C-alpha cells in the first residue's frame, strides 16, 4: 500500500462518505454535495444545483437491481441507476439516515433519532426504540447483518444484537472508559475467515466472537476514532481512522499504519477516512475528507468452474485439452466438461459424468485426453476408454482385453495413436495394449480382443504404468509407476529394453513423462526433471530444498517447459535447462498450452488459472464497452435533465433530431484494476471509411454537423498484436430529417 491513483470530485465535493458497485461494475461515489459515479476515466455527477438531490450522502445500499437507495439529512434518495432518474416512493422515510443494511427483503434504517425497518413490498416502516425495545441509544451509525442472518447495531452509546423471537435488542458489553463519556460504535464488520465481527470505537479496535462471547480488543490508538472497516484481497483486517490507514494480518504481525505525505501526490490523498470498500476485484477505495485514494490490486486470473456451468459442483482437473475443432475439454475427478470461450461469457458448457441423464460416462475418473490422425477424440478412464461422436455429443465406450484373462482396460491411464493406425493403450493392472484402431471402431462387441499387448511375460518392468510415449523415430517409451528407470518397446522387433535404471531410481523414482517439440524426452522424479536424447544421449537437474516436492504436472511451452509442483511453478529452458520459480500459493494438477491463444491453462481445485506464455505478467479479463456520457452540442445530457434523450449505458439504438447532431461520447471498459489503460479504435459507419485511433488517455470520441440518415458508431479494443477487437460495442444512430421530428426518442 505504498502508493495510490487519486481521484477528486471538485473542490465544493471534497469529502466521500460511501462507495457502491453496481451488478455490472460501475463504482458509484457519495459526496458531501451528491451522488457521482467515475468511470475509470472521469467523474459524472447526477445532480443539479440547488435541488433536493444536492444533498451530502452519508450511506448507500444497492435495491432490485436498479436502485441506489442514499442515506440524507431528509431521508431517502431512491435514484434509478438503470433509468437516470429519481424516483421517489409514496414512503414517509425519517430524516439523518446513517447507516442500512439489508435482510432479506427488509431494509434496516440507522438514523439520528431511531432504528427503522422498511418492508420492501409491502413497504412497512416499522420503529425500534429505547423504553419499547431496550435500545441501549437512539443514535444509529452501524448497522450489519451476518451471514448467519443475525442483524448487529452500532449507536452513540453501545453495541447490540437483535431478538427476532421478541422484538427486543440484547446488549453486547463493550468495555466502558472513563476517558469516554458515550460509546461511539462508528463501524462493524464481519469476517468470515477469522469469525468475528470488527467493530470500531473511539481509541479502539475490537474482535467480537458470536461462538463463545468473547471481545477481544485487538488494537488500542491512543486518540484516534476508527471510523471504517474491510477487508483486502489478502485477507488482511484495514481500518480507517481520522489519522490514517491501519492494517492488520495477525496478532504477531506489524501493522502497517499508512499516512499522507503532503509533499507526495501519490500518498494516501487524506489522513481521514470516513469509509473503505473492497471492489469486486478486489482494489481498495479509500474514501475521505479531500477525496478519494484508489489501490489497486494486481495478480493470475482464476477462473471457478461454476463461471462456465453454474452448477456449483465441484472438479479436480487432471487433463485439460483443445481440440481441432475449437473446443476446450476439462475433466478430471468428477468428470469432463466439454465447452467454449474461456472466458467469455458463454460457454454451452456440457459435463460428462457417471450418472447424467442426459450426458453419461461409464467412469467420472479421467486420466488423460487426446485426439487422433483423423481428429477422432478420445479419453481414457477407471472406466476403460471412450470416443467421442460430436454428431450424437455423446460418448461411445469399449471393453478391451488380451487373448487371455485378465488384462483388460477398465482401468486406462494413457492413449495415442502410432503412424500405422494402431492405438496404444496404457493400463494399470492390464499393461499396454495394442489395438487396430478402425476395427476397435467398426467393431459389434463384445469386448474386443486386442492385436497385442505388453505384459511382463514377454517384457515390461511391471504392468502398472502410468504414460506411454513416442519417440520421433518410432519406440514407445513407458513411464512405470513404483519402479526404476523406464522401457523402450521397439514395436518392430518387440524388443523391450529397460533404460536408465542407475539413476531413475530410490528417491528418483520416475513419475512423468513427456515429449517436445525437438524429440526429446523430459522425466519428472521427486527434485527434478531429466531430458534425454533418445538415441545419441541417454543428463538431469535438481530444484533444491525442496525437496520434499513433488511434480504434479509438465507442458511444454515455446522454447521451455513448465513445471507445477507441491511447492509452486517452475521454468526451466529446454535448451540450458536452467530453472526458475514462479509466486499463488494455489497448487495446479494439469496444464495447457494453447498456441494460438498464446496462453496457459493451469488446472486445479474446483476451477483453473490463465497466464500468457509469457508470465510478465497478468492475464487481463475480457471487459465489455460501455458508453458512460452522451453530449449533444457540448452539453451533457440524460434522462435525469431531458424527457428527449436516454441512458446511453443501456441503449443499443439512439434517434435524435435534425439539429442533435454534434455528438460526443465517451467510452470505458472500467479499467479500475489497470495501470495502463487500454487501447482503441473506433468508426462512424455511413461517414468513416477507416479506423481511428484514439490516443490511450482520451476516451472521447466527437463527430460534427451529421446530415441527417442512419449511422452505427463501432468502438473496438486494440487486442494485444495491434489488431481491432471482433467483438466491439455498436450504437445505431439515427439523425432524423426535419420533417419526422416526432419520432424523437421520448421518456
Keep these: 500500500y505504498q502508493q495510490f491513483d487519486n481521484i477528486y470530485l471538485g473542490a465544493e465535493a471534497s469529502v466521500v462518505s460511501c462507495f457502491l458497485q453496481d451488478s455490472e461494475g460501475l463504482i458509484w461515489i457519495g459526496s458531501n454535495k451528491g451522488l457521482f459515479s467515475y468511470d475509470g476515466y472521469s467523474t459524472q455527477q447526477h445532480f443539479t444545483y ?93 448497522i450489519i447483518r451476518t451471514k448467519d442472518n443475525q442483524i448487529y447495531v452500532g449507536t452513540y452509546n453501545g453495541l447490540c444484537r437483535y431478538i427476532p423471537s421478541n ?122 475528507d479531500y477525496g478519494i485514494s484508489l489501490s489497486r490490486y494486481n495478480s493470475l ?40 470461450d474461456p472466458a467469455g461469457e458463454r460457454h454451452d458448457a456440457i459435463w460428462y459424468r457417471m450418472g447424467d441423464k442426459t450426458y453419461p460416462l461409464s467412469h467420472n475418473r479421467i486420466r488423460h485426453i487426446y485426439e487422433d490422425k483423423e481428429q477422432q477424440l478420445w479419453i481414457a478412464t477407471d472406466g476403460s476408454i471412450n470416443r467421442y461422436d460430436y454428431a450424437t455429443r455423446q460418448f461411445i465406450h469399449y471393453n478391451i482385453v488380451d487373448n487371455t484373462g485378465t488384462y483388460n482396460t477398465n482401468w486406462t491411464y494413457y492413449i495415442f495413436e502410432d503412424t500405422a493406425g494402431q492405438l496404444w493403450i496404457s493400463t494399470c493392472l492390464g499393461g499396454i495394449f495394442v489395438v487396430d484402431k478402425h476395427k476397435l471402431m467398426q467393431s459389434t462387441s463384445g469386448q474386443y480382443i486386442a492385436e497385442q499387448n505388453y505384459s511382463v511375460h514377454n517384457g515390461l518392468s511391471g504392468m502398472f504404468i502410468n504414460q506411454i510415449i513416442p519417440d520421433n523415430e518410432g519406440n514407445v517409451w513407458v513411464l512405470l509407476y513404483n519402479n526404476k528407470g523406464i522401457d523402450k518397446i521397439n514395436p518392430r522387433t518387440r524388443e523391450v529394453t529397460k533404460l536408465f535404471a542407475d539413476e531413475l531410481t530410490g528417491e528418483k523414482s520416475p513419475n512423468y513423462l513427456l515429449c517436445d517439440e525437438d524429440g526429446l ?101 475480457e471487459r465489455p464497452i460501455l458508453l458512460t456520457a452522451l453530449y449533444i452540442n457540448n452539453q451533457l445530457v440524460s434522462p435525469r435533465t431531458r424527457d428527449d434523450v436516454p441512458n446511453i449505458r443501456y441503449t443499443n439504438s439512439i434517434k435524435l433530431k435534425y439539429d442533435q447532431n454534434n455528438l460526443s461520447f465517451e467510452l470505458s471498459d472500467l479499467p479500475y484494476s489497470l495501470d495502463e489503460k487500454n487501447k482503441f479504435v473506433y468508426r462512424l459507419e455511413g461517414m468513416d471509411k477507416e479506423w481511428n485511433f484514439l490516443k490511450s488517455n482520451i476516451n472521447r470520441i466527437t463527430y460534427s454537423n451529421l446530415s441527417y440518415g442512419n449511422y452505427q458508431l463501432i468502438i473496438s479494443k486494440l487486442e494485444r498484436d495491434g489488431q481491432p477487437s471482433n467483438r466491439p460495442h455498436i450504437l445505431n444512430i439515427r439523425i432524423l430529417p426535419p420533417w419526422l421530428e416526432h419520432h424523437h426518442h421520448h421518456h
Design 50 to 142: 440547488g435541488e433536493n438531490n444536492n444533498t451530502r450522502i452519508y450511506c448507500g445500499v444497492i435495491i432490485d437491481n436498479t436502485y441506489l437507495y442514499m442515506g440524507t439529512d431528509n431521508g431517502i434518495l431512491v435514484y434509478n441507476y438503470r433509468a437516470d432518474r429519481y424516483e421517489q416512493p409514496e414512503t414517509d422515510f425519517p430524516t439523518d439516515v446513517r447507516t442500512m443494511a439489508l435482510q432479506g427483503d427488509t431494509l434496516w434504517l440507522g438514523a439520528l433519532n431511531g432504528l427503522y425497518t422498511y418492508q420492501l413490498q409491502s413497504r412497512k416502516l416499522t420503529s425500534f426504540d429505547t423504553r419499547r425495545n431496550g435500545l441501549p441509544n437512539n443514535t444509529i451509525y452501524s
Design 521 to 621: 524426452l523430459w522425466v519428472g522424479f521427486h527434485g527434478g526433471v531429466m531430458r534425454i536424447n533418445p538415441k545419441d544421449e541417454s543428463q538431469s537437474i535438481s530444484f533444491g530444498s525442496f525437496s520434499n516436492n513433488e511434480i504434479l504436472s509438465m507442458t511444454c511451452v515455446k522454447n521451455s517447459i513448465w513445471v507445477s509442483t507441491t511447492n509452486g511453478l517452475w521454468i526451466i529452458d529446454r535448451k540450458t535447462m536452467d530453472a526458475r520459480q514462479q509466486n499463488t500459493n494455489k497448487r495446479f494438477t494439469s496444464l495447457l498450452f494453447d498456441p494460438k491463444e498464446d496462453c496457459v491453462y493451469l488446472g486445479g481445485a474446483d476451477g483453473f488459472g490463465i497466464s500468457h506464455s509469457n508470465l510478465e505478467a497478468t492475464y487481463q479479463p
Design 301 to 340: 486470473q482464476f477462473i471457478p468452474i461454476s463461471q462456465i456451468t453454474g452448477t456449483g459442483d465441484g472438479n479436480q482437473f487432471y487433463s485439460l485439452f483443445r481440440d481441432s475443432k475449437g473446443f476446450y475439454w476439462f475433466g478430471g475427478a468428477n468428470g469432463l466438461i466439454r465447452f467454449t
Design 167 to 288: 422484538g427486543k435488542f440484547e446488549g453486547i458489553p463493550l468495555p466502558v472508559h472513563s476517558s469516554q463519556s458515550n460509546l461511539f460504535v462508528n463501524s462493524l464488520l464481519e469476517d468470515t475467515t477469522r469469525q468475528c465481527v470488527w467493530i470500531g470505537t473511539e481509541g479502539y479496535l475490537f474482535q467480537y466472537f458470536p461462538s463463545t462471547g468473547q471481545i477481544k480488543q485487538t488494537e488500542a490508538f491512543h486518540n484516534n476514532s476508527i471510523k471504517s472497516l474491510a477487508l483486502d484481497g489478502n485477507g488482511d483486517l484495514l481500518a480507517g481512522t481520522d489519522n490514517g490507514l491501519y492494517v492488520y494480518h495477525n496478532d504477531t504481525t506489524p501493522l502497517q499504519h499508512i499516512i499522507h505525505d503532503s509533499r507526495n501526490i501519490q500518498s494516501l490523498t487524506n489522513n481521514i477516512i470516513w469509509n473503505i470498500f473492497a471492489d469486486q476485484e478486489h482494489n481498495i477505495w479509500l474514501g475521505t
